[PDB]
Amino acid sequence: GTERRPGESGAWKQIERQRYASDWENDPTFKRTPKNLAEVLDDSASMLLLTDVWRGMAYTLGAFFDKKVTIMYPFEKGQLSPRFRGEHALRRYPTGEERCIACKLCEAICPAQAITIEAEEREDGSRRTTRYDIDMTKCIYCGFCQEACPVDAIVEGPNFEFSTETREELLYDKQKLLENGDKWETEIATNLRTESLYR
Amino acid sequence: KRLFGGAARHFYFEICRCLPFIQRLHKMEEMVSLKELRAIVKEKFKEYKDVKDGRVVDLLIFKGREEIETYLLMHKQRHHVVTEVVEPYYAKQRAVKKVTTNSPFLDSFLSSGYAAIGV
Amino acid sequence: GFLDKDSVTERVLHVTKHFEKIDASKVSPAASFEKDLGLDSLDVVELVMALEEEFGLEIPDAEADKIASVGDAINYICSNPMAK
Amino acid sequence: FKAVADVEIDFNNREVLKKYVGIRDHLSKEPGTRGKLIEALTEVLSSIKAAPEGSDYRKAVEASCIYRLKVCKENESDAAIEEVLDAHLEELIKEAKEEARLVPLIAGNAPWDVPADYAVPVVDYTDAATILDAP
Amino acid sequence: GYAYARKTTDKDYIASEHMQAFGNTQLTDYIIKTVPKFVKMAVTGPAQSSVLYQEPTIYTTPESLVPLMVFLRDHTNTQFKCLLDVTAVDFPERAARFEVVYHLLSPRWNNRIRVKVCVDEVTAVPTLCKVFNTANWFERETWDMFGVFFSGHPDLRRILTDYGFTGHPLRKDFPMTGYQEVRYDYGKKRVVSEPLELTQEFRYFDFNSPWETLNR
Amino acid sequence: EFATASADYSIAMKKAAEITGAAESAMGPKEGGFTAGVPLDTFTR
Amino acid sequence: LTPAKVNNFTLNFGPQVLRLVLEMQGEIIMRADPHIGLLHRGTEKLLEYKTYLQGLPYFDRLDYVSMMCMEHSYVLAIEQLLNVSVPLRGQYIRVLFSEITRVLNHLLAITCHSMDVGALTPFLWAFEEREKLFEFYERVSGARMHAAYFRVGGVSQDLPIGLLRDVYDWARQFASRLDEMEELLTGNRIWKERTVDVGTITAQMAWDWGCSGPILRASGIDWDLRKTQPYDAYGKMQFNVPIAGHGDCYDRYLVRLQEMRESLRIIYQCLNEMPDGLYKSPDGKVCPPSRSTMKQSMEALIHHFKLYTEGFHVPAGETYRAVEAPKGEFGVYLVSRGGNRPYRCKIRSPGYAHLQMTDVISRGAMLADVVTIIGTLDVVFGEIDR
Amino acid sequence: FEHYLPMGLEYRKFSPGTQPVKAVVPHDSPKLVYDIKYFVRDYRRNNKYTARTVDAKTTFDFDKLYAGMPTKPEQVKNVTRPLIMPTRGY
Numbered sequence A: 001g002t003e004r005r006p007g008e009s010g011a012w013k014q015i016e017r018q019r020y021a022s023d024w025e026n027d028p029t030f031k032r033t034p035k036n037l038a039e040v041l042d043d044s045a046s047m048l049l050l051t052d053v054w055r056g057m058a059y060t061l062g063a064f065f066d067k068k069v070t071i072m073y074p075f076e077k078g079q080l081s082p083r084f085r086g087e088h089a090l091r092r093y094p095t096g097e098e099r100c101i102a103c104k105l106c107e108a109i110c111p112a113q114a115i116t117i118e119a120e121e122r123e124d125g126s127r128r129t130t131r132y133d134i135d136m137t138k139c140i141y142c143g144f145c146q147e148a149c150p151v152d153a154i155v156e157g158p159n160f161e162f163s164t165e166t167r168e169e170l171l172y173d174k175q176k177l178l179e180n181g182d183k184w185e186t187e188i189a190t191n192l193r194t195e196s197l198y199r
Numbered sequence B: 001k002r003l004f005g006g007a008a009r010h011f012y013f014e015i016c017r018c019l020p021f022i023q024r025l026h027k028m029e030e031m032v033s034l035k036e037l038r039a040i041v042k043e044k045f046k047e048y049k050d051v052k053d054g055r056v057v058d059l060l061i062f063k064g065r066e067e068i069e070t071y072l073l074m075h076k077q078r079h080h081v082v083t084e085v086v087e088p089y090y091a092k093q094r095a096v097k098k099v100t101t102n103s104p105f106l107d108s109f110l111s112s113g114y115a116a117i118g119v
Numbered sequence C: 001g002f003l004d005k006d007s008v009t010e011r012v013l014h015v016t017k018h019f020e021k022i023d024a025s026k027v028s029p030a031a032s033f034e035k036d037l038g039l040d041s042l043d044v045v046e047l048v049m050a051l052e053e054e055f056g057l058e059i060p061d062a063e064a065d066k067i068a069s070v071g072d073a074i075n076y077i078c079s080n081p082m083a084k
Numbered sequence D: 001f002k003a004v005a006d007v008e009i010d011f012n013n014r015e016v017l018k019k020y021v022g023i024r025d026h027l028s029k030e031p032g033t034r035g036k037l038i039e040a041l042t043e044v045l046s047s048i049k050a051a052p053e054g055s056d057y058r059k060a061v062e063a064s065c066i067y068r069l070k071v072c073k074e075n076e077s078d079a080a081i082e083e084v085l086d087a088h089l090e091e092l093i094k095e096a097k098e099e100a101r102l103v104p105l106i107a108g109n110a111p112w113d114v115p116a117d118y119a120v121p122v123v124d125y126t127d128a129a130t131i132l133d134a135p
Numbered sequence E: 001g002y003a004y005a006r007k008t009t010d011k012d013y014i015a016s017e018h019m020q021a022f023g024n025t026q027l028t029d030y031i032i033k034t035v036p037k038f039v040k041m042a043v044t045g046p047a048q049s050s051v052l053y054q055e056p057t058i059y060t061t062p063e064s065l066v067p068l069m070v071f072l073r074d075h076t077n078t079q080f081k082c083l084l085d086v087t088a089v090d091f092p093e094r095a096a097r098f099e100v101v102y103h104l105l106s107p108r109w110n111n112r113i114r115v116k117v118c119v120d121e122v123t124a125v126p127t128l129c130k131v132f133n134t135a136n137w138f139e140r141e142t143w144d145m146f147g148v149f150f151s152g153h154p155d156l157r158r159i160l161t162d163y164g165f166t167g168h169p170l171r172k173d174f175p176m177t178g179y180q181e182v183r184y185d186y187g188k189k190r191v192v193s194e195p196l197e198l199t200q201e202f203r204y205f206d207f208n209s210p211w212e213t214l215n216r
Numbered sequence F: 001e002f003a004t005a006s007a008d009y010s011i012a013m014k015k016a017a018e019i020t021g022a023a024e025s026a027m028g029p030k031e032g033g034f035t036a037g038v039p040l041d042t043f044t045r
Numbered sequence G: 001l002t003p004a005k006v007n008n009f010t011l012n013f014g015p016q017v018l019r020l021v022l023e024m025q026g027e028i029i030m031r032a033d034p035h036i037g038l039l040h041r042g043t044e045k046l047l048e049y050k051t052y053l054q055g056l057p058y059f060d061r062l063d064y065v066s067m068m069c070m071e072h073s074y075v076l077a078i079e080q081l082l083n084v085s086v087p088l089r090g091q092y093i094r095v096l097f098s099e100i101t102r103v104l105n106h107l108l109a110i111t112c113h114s115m116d117v118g119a120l121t122p123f124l125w126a127f128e129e130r131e132k133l134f135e136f137y138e139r140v141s142g143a144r145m146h147a148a149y150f151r152v153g154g155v156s157q158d159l160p161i162g163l164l165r166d167v168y169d170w171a172r173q174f175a176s177r178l179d180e181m182e183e184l185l186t187g188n189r190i191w192k193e194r195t196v197d198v199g200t201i202t203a204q205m206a207w208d209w210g211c212s213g214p215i216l217r218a219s220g221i222d223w224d225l226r227k228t229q230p231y232d233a234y235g236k237m238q239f240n241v242p243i244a245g246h247g248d249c250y251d252r253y254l255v256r257l258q259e260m261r262e263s264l265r266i267i268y269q270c271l272n273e274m275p276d277g278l279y280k281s282p283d284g285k286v287c288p289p290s291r292s293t294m295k296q297s298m299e300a301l302i303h304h305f306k307l308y309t310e311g312f313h314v315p316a317g318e319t320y321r322a323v324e325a326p327k328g329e330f331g332v333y334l335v336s337r338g339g340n341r342p343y344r345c346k347i348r349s350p351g352y353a354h355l356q357m358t359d360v361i362s363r364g365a366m367l368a369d370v371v372t373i374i375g376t377l378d379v380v381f382g383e384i385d386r
Numbered sequence H: 001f002e003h004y005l006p007m008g009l010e011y012r013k014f015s016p017g018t019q020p021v022k023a024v025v026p027h028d029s030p031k032l033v034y035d036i037k038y039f040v041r042d043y044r045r046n047n048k049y050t051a052r053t054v055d056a057k058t059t060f061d062f063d064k065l066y067a068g069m070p071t072k073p074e075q076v077k078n079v080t081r082p083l084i085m086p087t088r089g090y
């Protein structure tokens, strides 16, 4: 219970006060004095013989014979949603051409300054990037790039287990981003087939 | 009797009073004495010898009080003493009378396309 | 008067002798910190530090401010009761 | 509001609530009454006499004290005064004591000493909906 | 102390009609009439407390700031027992480049206020520790971030920057990334500050169109 | 009649810039730079 | 002006990120001098070089225990100067998710306080429901902690279908989880003797010390920003206010638990009153349009181009807005010059104010209670050091 | 007493990417689909600040202030807490 008692106060000013002033009696939140032999025995059973530890002990013991929520990674995984923002990736069109058209909206919107873009017109007249780099060690995975891109080029893929032994491996270039997109395209397209009703 | 009441000399005297405890607490017995430590503190004062506002001098003294106080509570470890106190002295007394006969302009030209900045 | 006027003077001269900014022969038994030596307030503070360090006493800032001459320091030490 | 203790507390008896909210422990062990508030208001009115009669600060403090005294006069039950003033009597006692204590510093500084042509620039903010919504 | 739990029932209401109407329409005029010397400039602003009202803002010299705060905390009509924070703003265009800010809360009447004093780099600001305990650390942080001095303070020293840091980073002239960077050296076995150097320099982008009218 | 962008907070920034006492502050050459605490070579450029 | 002379007592309490220096004449604390700034990231200056939308994620990492509350104050401060009305469904979602965030903050705070005291089971037990609510967050924003969900004029996305089902399912047993949580400490003499009458605070000191949140409530003070200065749909919500009168660690514990109960009540009320309609403000000149709208309309495409590069230009002015944070009152002061970047953005943190009470409160206490003081203070240095 | 960790199909039965029902999320007001005029609804660029007159020779009658205040337990009026913030029809 939440009631209070004299001597169970953890201080000196309050303890010295209550043993030398009956101020706690005026407080209704303090358990009132026992008035008969029965109430005295109840108080003794409360203080001695524990009877407060016993309840929490029993509940924990029941928890011992209870079920668990533990999962066996990597042979089991968790639950996630299509909106999950993971590894940035570059997407193409089904014919095979890059979706990114170097409008540089992603670099403009990125508050992390982790995107470096250089681009010029391709030999066929197409407006394509010449350098597309995103610093994953600097990327904050906010997904604002995925929000800004109007051609669904840059996407944060459902890949999240991409830790490396060296920091240099995380300096993502155009080629590795395109590799990631070609790898994870089907899952991203399936998620977009759901997210399109919200985005 | 002195400019702006001479608060600068009082501040220097106070810091010199507090100096030896810093030397003993920070194990500068085997690097420096009281005299050249005092010389270091003196050279620190010369950075602003030409200030013409008493208020600016007061704020300088207050920030110097804070610096010496964070020196007093050891909040700046031995590495701060290394990087600001005794190695600069060793460099100052170490590169004395260098053998380079070129002018500083020519030194800068042989250095780089821009002048050096920072310490 | 708490100490001898001579031994104090030679001790003062000796502690003056080990300063890099001073001329060993320009130091006289009586001189001026400003006009003769061309030393500023901070140099005078350093002088007071050295003198007190040799003589094992303590000097408040105001007394040091009053001190501006070799004879000033000698008479101040001789007037100090904690003299050793 | 909600009491935190697992026990049932009546709280209809005002002193029981005063014990629960700790006014007895942290603000005033002594129960505040109408008479004490009357004394405090009278002291404030006596204290404010250090201000010049031409000061508007004195005028406003006098108006506040007069209103409070009228409230105290026309109300008998202290709970009625609590309902009127949206607080407890001890709070009002502290307010009156604080206001009386404020007087000497103001008298020592006297903000009313300004030139007859003292100028106060005033800037007001107007909402856009004033001209946009239905008049 | 105020705002004590008085009613045992739920409250569907905020404050009283007369008090709210005064605090929202004639509070500024009351402040002006009471202590015009303490008043230098008046702005009734966007009502920090609520989106549907008006609230004032105070400008004055640092000389009378302390008695003004005393009155604002202690006046029977202005029981501003909660000083939220003390901060400052840099105005490098002005003769006085600093606008120290003072915010108050009045749980007695569900109100708020802003108090500002405009000063330069070399003028002291009397401390409000004697009026509010919390001003200590706020004054400390303001001094750390701008160099705004507070006279009579118990111990005014830096609280947020580095131990050996000189300079006030929130100044407009202060560089975004600064002057010094720190790294560990194996040879000296010590972590040392070094001149700032960047593998990729920061990119500043000018999006401000030459047609916007709201620019001030 | 006076109308120079008279429907914005800029007027509130026009004033509080002309406050008496606060409008008479002045500092000498290089004096504010001393208060900066930045490395002294900043002023050489 | 001050020498050192007497060294005598000397202490160093932790480089590991709170640094504490104390002063005892023995077993009882006489002085306590915290030193902070080991997490001061200088965000406020950094804010000046970012657009309003760019700087929004900064507010995620100010209190990484309670995020949407941190977003909400800045968003409201922007909108009030922008004079923008928020749609009803967006307000419902904001209030509901804010209650869930408050529940998370209370859970983690109480569990950490218990672990510091010495109880480890509630820590692990409550982190399971915390993982459940993290799953809720990820379903709606794709991020477990740094959602960046709140937007000027609404939210980024609408709630996915089937979310409220699991929300109600979680609420159907959260009360049982809380009940089993209480029995480990509530009826325990040890927990009380550790917590009772430790760090007593008065109403007068608290208002002098600028307290906010549950600490204020435990001093017999009737105050909730959600009932005195309501924002969004909090005025419609009906819920109780726990009140204590000792200023005790046990009292603050009970106050936080009852606050969790009231949060659950508000969650239920929001669940059964979810309206159908727009979730973003219809002003495309501030709020981004739909991607479908952008890809088929020139005007929405232009607005998407401009907002996502330059952003809306807040009119010059100033405002300060605060939100009833789980750790107190979280406020942000906004200074507007007229451009697309905030001129000066000052951040007010309740824990920073609460952390200032250590020296006066820890007086007369014992080293076993400093950890109690810190735990019951419920302080995150991310907001304390910005 | 409710048990944690429900069994299969009692919690999160469907994965988020496989909702059984198509989602129809509105993205514009039906009132504003074809009536796209903006000046009637440009609150942002229409707010105003005005420099009021010099408030020096004004007469603040506190008598009128205190005449509007109650004197009894009854006759006391309180401003109700607003339920929601303005929405302007959306």
Ligand SMILES: CCCCCCCCCCCC(=O)SCCNC(=O)CCNC(=O)[C@H](O)C(C)(C)COP(=O)(O)O
Pocket (backbone or CB within 6 Å): B002, B003, B004, B008, B009, B015, B041, B044, B045, B046, B047, B048, B049, B050, B051, B052, B057, B060, B061, B064, B065, B067, B068, B071, C039, C040, C041, C042
């Ligand atoms: C461990 C040590 C830590 C040290 C940290 C603190 C370092 C503080 C250093 C900066 C303090 C100052 O410059 S304090 C600023 C001092 N400048 C002024 O006051 C304006 C007028 N110039 C003077 O007074 C000069 O001292 C002088 C021309 C020599 C007068 O000659 P004298 O002297 O004959 O009197």
Ligand code: SF4
Pocket (backbone or CB within 6 Å): A099, A100, A101, A102, A103, A104, A105, A106, A107, A148, A149, A150, A151, A152, A153, A154
């Ligand atoms: S990824 Fe998208 S937003 Fe970024 S440059 Fe390419 S097309 Fe533009």
Ligand code: SF4
Pocket (backbone or CB within 6 Å): A088, A109, A110, A111, A112, A114, A115, A134, A138, A139, A140, A141, A142, A143, A144, A145, A146, A156
């Ligand atoms: S997810 Fe955020 S941090 Fe990463 S590239 Fe996109 S905008 Fe930049």
